[PDB]
Design an enzyme around this catalytic site. Structure first.
Site, PDB file in Angstrom:
ATOM      1  N   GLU A  35       0.826  -1.188   0.000  1.00  0.00           N
ATOM      2  CA  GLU A  35       0.000   0.000   0.000  1.00  0.00           C
ATOM      3  C   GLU A  35       0.870   1.252   0.000  1.00  0.00           C
ATOM      4  O   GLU A  35       0.574   2.204  -0.724  1.00  0.00           O
ATOM      5  CB  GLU A  35      -0.916   0.008   1.217  1.00  0.00           C
ATOM      6  CG  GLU A  35      -2.052  -1.035   1.175  1.00  0.00           C
ATOM      7  CD  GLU A  35      -3.071  -0.778   0.088  1.00  0.00           C
ATOM      8  OE1 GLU A  35      -3.956  -1.639  -0.072  1.00  0.00           O
ATOM      9  OE2 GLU A  35      -2.978   0.256  -0.615  1.00  0.00           O
ATOM     10  N   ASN A  46      -7.641   8.650  -5.709  1.00  0.00           N
ATOM     11  CA  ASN A  46      -8.417   7.631  -6.394  1.00  0.00           C
ATOM     12  C   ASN A  46      -9.226   8.245  -7.560  1.00  0.00           C
ATOM     13  O   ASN A  46      -9.494   9.456  -7.591  1.00  0.00           O
ATOM     14  CB  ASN A  46      -9.333   6.921  -5.382  1.00  0.00           C
ATOM     15  CG  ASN A  46      -8.569   6.329  -4.190  1.00  0.00           C
ATOM     16  OD1 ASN A  46      -8.954   6.517  -3.020  1.00  0.00           O
ATOM     17  ND2 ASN A  46      -7.479   5.633  -4.467  1.00  0.00           N
ATOM     18  N   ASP A  48     -12.322   8.159  -8.124  1.00  0.00           N
ATOM     19  CA  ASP A  48     -13.601   8.722  -7.686  1.00  0.00           C
ATOM     20  C   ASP A  48     -13.438  10.047  -6.947  1.00  0.00           C
ATOM     21  O   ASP A  48     -14.422  10.608  -6.458  1.00  0.00           O
ATOM     22  CB  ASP A  48     -14.375   7.724  -6.798  1.00  0.00           C
ATOM     23  CG  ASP A  48     -13.681   7.425  -5.467  1.00  0.00           C
ATOM     24  OD1 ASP A  48     -12.655   8.061  -5.126  1.00  0.00           O
ATOM     25  OD2 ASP A  48     -14.185   6.544  -4.741  1.00  0.00           O
ATOM     26  N   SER A  50     -11.698  10.508  -4.137  1.00  0.00           N
ATOM     27  CA  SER A  50     -11.266  10.334  -2.762  1.00  0.00           C
ATOM     28  C   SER A  50      -9.754  10.188  -2.781  1.00  0.00           C
ATOM     29  O   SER A  50      -9.154  10.045  -3.859  1.00  0.00           O
ATOM     30  CB  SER A  50     -11.922   9.104  -2.111  1.00  0.00           C
ATOM     31  OG  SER A  50     -11.560   7.925  -2.807  1.00  0.00           O
ATOM     32  N   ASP A  52      -6.390   8.148  -0.637  1.00  0.00           N
ATOM     33  CA  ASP A  52      -5.872   7.142   0.304  1.00  0.00           C
ATOM     34  C   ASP A  52      -4.689   7.713   1.098  1.00  0.00           C
ATOM     35  O   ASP A  52      -3.816   8.346   0.512  1.00  0.00           O
ATOM     36  CB  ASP A  52      -5.396   5.896  -0.428  1.00  0.00           C
ATOM     37  CG  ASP A  52      -6.523   5.078  -1.026  1.00  0.00           C
ATOM     38  OD1 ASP A  52      -7.716   5.303  -0.708  1.00  0.00           O
ATOM     39  OD2 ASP A  52      -6.176   4.186  -1.824  1.00  0.00           O
ATOM     40  N   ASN A  59      -9.018   5.267   3.070  1.00  0.00           N
ATOM     41  CA  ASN A  59      -9.689   6.130   2.119  1.00  0.00           C
ATOM     42  C   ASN A  59     -10.626   7.154   2.754  1.00  0.00           C
ATOM     43  O   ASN A  59     -11.251   6.910   3.808  1.00  0.00           O
ATOM     44  CB  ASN A  59     -10.443   5.230   1.145  1.00  0.00           C
ATOM     45  CG  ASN A  59     -10.981   5.948  -0.013  1.00  0.00           C
ATOM     46  OD1 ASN A  59     -12.152   6.306  -0.019  1.00  0.00           O
ATOM     47  ND2 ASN A  59     -10.160   6.141  -1.038  1.00  0.00           N
ATOM     48  N   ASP A 101     -15.345  -4.720   9.188  1.00  0.00           N
ATOM     49  CA  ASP A 101     -16.496  -4.193   8.426  1.00  0.00           C
ATOM     50  C   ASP A 101     -17.301  -5.251   7.671  1.00  0.00           C
ATOM     51  O   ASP A 101     -18.394  -4.958   7.200  1.00  0.00           O
ATOM     52  CB  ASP A 101     -16.015  -3.115   7.429  1.00  0.00           C
ATOM     53  CG  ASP A 101     -17.149  -2.332   6.790  1.00  0.00           C
ATOM     54  OD1 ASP A 101     -17.803  -1.539   7.505  1.00  0.00           O
ATOM     55  OD2 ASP A 101     -17.377  -2.486   5.564  1.00  0.00           O
TER      56      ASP A 101
END
Ligand SMILES: [Cl-]
Ligand SMILES: [Cl-]
Ligand SMILES: [Cl-]
Ligand SMILES: [Cl-]
Ligand SMILES: [Cl-]
Ligand SMILES: [Cl-]
Ligand code: NA
Length: 129
Positions: A35, A46, A48, A50, A52, A59, A101
């Protein structure tokens, strides 16, 4: 801060990630390698819109607030900048929430693609733990 491999393993262990939700320490170290290359200051935008943040690339659409991700949530109740600190406490606490989650570490696409199913114990080999 750029952690050493075993230095990060040690910090993750102290913060309670070894076998958290059943994921051995090598999983967490492997995920952090791909990562962020163990760099707490890593950030990546990202598609979209957003971003990280940090050693585990958490995110802003769901987990932290960075003030620029529309329609997003902040489920870890933290500024995303806290995820860049040399102190990995915020990243670990938030990671615990993420991995709880429902889809486990599959939440980290790089874990799924590069760590899952591999000999992740190699990542903590030789480490004083
Ligand atoms: Cl390495
Ligand atoms: Cl392991
Ligand atoms: Cl936002
Ligand atoms: Cl904030
Ligand atoms: Cl730390
Ligand atoms: Cl990937
Ligand atoms: Na957000």
């Amino acid at each position: 801060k750029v952690f050493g491999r075993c230095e990060l393993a040690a910090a993750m262990k102290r913060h309670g990630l070894d076998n958290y939700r059943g994921y051995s320490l090598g999983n967490w170290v492997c995920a952090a390698k791909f990562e962020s290359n163990f760099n707490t200051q890593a950030t990546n935008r990202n598609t979209d819109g957003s971003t990280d943040y940090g050693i585990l690339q958490i995110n802003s659409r769901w987990w932290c607030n960075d003030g620029r991700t529309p329609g997003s949530r902040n489920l870890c109740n933290i500024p995303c900048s806290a995820l860049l600190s040399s102190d990995i406490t915020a990243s670990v606490n938030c990671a615990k929430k993420i991995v709880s989650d429902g889809n486990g570490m599959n939440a980290w696409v790089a874990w799924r693609n590069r760590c899952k199913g591999t000999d992740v114990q190699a990542w903590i080999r030789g480490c004083r733990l």
